[PDB]
Ligand binder design. Structure first.
Ligand SMILES: CN(CCc1ccccc1)C(=O)Nc1cccc(S(N)(=O)=O)c1
Ligand code: NA
Ligand SMILES: [Zn+2]
Length: 258
């Protein structure tokens, strides 16, 4: 009886195995755009993905992860609210059963169709497993998806998903360029938070871009054909794999822009 996104094991249950679910810096949150304060001291984000080395795509039963070689400084996030250098390890998405829901963060209570998470770890902690034990261990770049025009740089991901339909399946996924998933503007909001899945560790500097990317209805429909189940198990579509907004508590969301 493992955690997931169903009636019996969804987000309102997670606190029983992971009491930090009711903690002081949980994610995601609603971004109230009028309450966020412009912080003129925040730096432009530096996203250096030219040498990114993708390896593999995995259906882990909760989402799919596009994994990167993080054994060298090859794809890094720096600047913005961050001290030091954070290395890209993986990206994944959260999405809905309907275009009206799917994102984890909300903007003035608006839900997007999906949300991309580019996960990075602080190189001063040596590896990802040590970094998630630290309050500044991770930096997650969050990008909203809206349904409209196709995102050409997403299509190589969409086309491999038939090969990883079910939990525990993986496929080689080399030479994928995550620069094709970024919007034009790097304007962002930032706050201290957590992983949005168990174990819900409070180790994340969240950086949420203001500008969504557009994907097509056909692209998101292909996400919704994935399965939470393993092969030879009853089919349960991988949809609504998002945690709802959590209380802000004693936190301030800062804006990089006016
Ligand atoms: C649920 N797990 C299992 C992996 C795990 C297990 C033990 C320790 C640490 C990590 C997981 O990988 N979550 C996760 C990881 C990175 C980013 C995000 S998100 N959605 O961007 O906040 C969620
Ligand atoms: Na305002
Ligand atoms: Zn995520």
């Amino acid at each position: 009886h493992h955690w997931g996104y169903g009636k019996h094991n969804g987000p309102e249950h997670w606190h029983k195995d992971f009491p930090i679910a009711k903690g002081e810096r949980q994610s995601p949150v609603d971004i109230d755009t009028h309450t966020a304060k412009y912080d003129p001291s925040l730096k432009p984000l530096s996203v250096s993905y030219d040498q990114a080395t993708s390896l593999r795509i995995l259906n882990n039963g909760h989402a799919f992860n596009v994994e990167f070689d993080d054994s060298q400084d090859k794809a890094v996030l720096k600047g913005g609210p961050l001290d030091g250098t954070y290395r890209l390890i993986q990206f994944h998405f959260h999405w809905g059963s309907l275009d009206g829901q799917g994102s984890e963060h909300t903007v003035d209570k608006k839900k997007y169709a999906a949300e991309l998470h580019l996960v990075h770890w602080n190189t001063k902690y040596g590896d990802f497993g040590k970094a998630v034990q630290q309050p500044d261990g991770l930096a997650v770049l969050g990008i909203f998806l809206k349904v409209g025009s196709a995102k050409p740089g997403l299509q190589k991901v969409v086309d491999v998903l038939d090969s990883i339909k079910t939990k525990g399946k993986s496929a080689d996924f080399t030479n994928f360029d995550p620069r094709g998933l970024l919007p034009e503007s790097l304007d962002y909001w930032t706050y201290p938070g957590s992983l949005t899945t168990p174990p819900l560790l409070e180790c994340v500097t969240w950086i949420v871009l203001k500008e969504p990317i557009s994907v097509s209805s056909e692209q998101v429909l292909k996400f919704r054909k994935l399965n939470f189940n393993g092969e030879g198990e009853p089919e349960e579509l991988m949809v609504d794999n998002w945690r709802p907004a959590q209380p802000l508590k004693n936190r301030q969301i800062k804006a990089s822009f006016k």
